[PDB]
Amino acid sequence: IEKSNIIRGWIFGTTLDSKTQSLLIVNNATNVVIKVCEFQFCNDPFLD
Amino acid sequence: CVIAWNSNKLDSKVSGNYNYLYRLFRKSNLKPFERDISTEIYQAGNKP
Amino acid sequence: FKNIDGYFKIYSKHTPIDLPQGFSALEPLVDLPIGINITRFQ
Ligand SMILES: *[C@@H]1O[C@H](CO)[C@@H](O)[C@H](O)[C@H]1NC(C)=O
Numbered sequence: 001i002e003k004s005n006i007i008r009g010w011i012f013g014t015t016l017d018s019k020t021q022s023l024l025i026v027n028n029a030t031n032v033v034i035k036v037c038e039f040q041f042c043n044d045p046f047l048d
Numbered sequence: 049c050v051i052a053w054n055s056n057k058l059d060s061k062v063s064g065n066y067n068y069l070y071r072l073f074r075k076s077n078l079k080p081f082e083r084d085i086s087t088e089i090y091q092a093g094n095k096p
Numbered sequence: 097f098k099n100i101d102g103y104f105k106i107y108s109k110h111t112p113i114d115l116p117q118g119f120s121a122l123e124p125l126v127d128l129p130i131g132i133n134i135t136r137f138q
């Protein structure tokens with residue numbers, strides 16, 4: 001239940017670290033980017 | 049379909065090739081159509 | 097979101113409006129051959 005598009009995307013994986021696989025789905029107002037790579041996260045994931 | 053053929057003249061070197069690797073140890077059996085590329089040592093004991 | 101046999105499936109729907117009492121369906125929109133192990137999400 002949303003207005004003004006606050007919710008953006010999702011992350012899927014096993015441990016969400018630079019070691020094992022990770023899926024990112026991002027929706028940065030232009031296109032639906034789906035990216036499965038070996039990806040690093042921080043403890044406060046946010047977008048401007 | 050499964051296709052198999054011979055590549056002796058394309059993957060054999062007199063000095064020996066070591067570019068091709070396999071895995072021998074894992075904790076649990078593999079799910080169908082699954083790929084794992086971990087490198088963690090097989091924990092056979094208690095001390096890491 | 098579903099993940100079976102190495103395939104990742106995503107169904108979606110949008111509508112205008114606690115959750116409301118009503119009936120609606122969802123249409124398939126994404127299928128991908130990801131084929132990995134997924135346990136936790138964010
Ligand atoms: C941001 O949007 C552009 C639009 O072309 C896209 O190419 C890019 O992958 C997007 N980045 C993220 C992190 O979603």
Ligand SMILES: *[C@@H]1O[C@H](CO)[C@@H](O)[C@H](O)[C@H]1NC(C)=O
Binds near residue numbers: 014077133
């Ligand atoms: C997926 O990862 C979890 C995390 O440890 C593991 O317990 C599970 O066995 C893995 N899946 C398979 C099929 O091995």
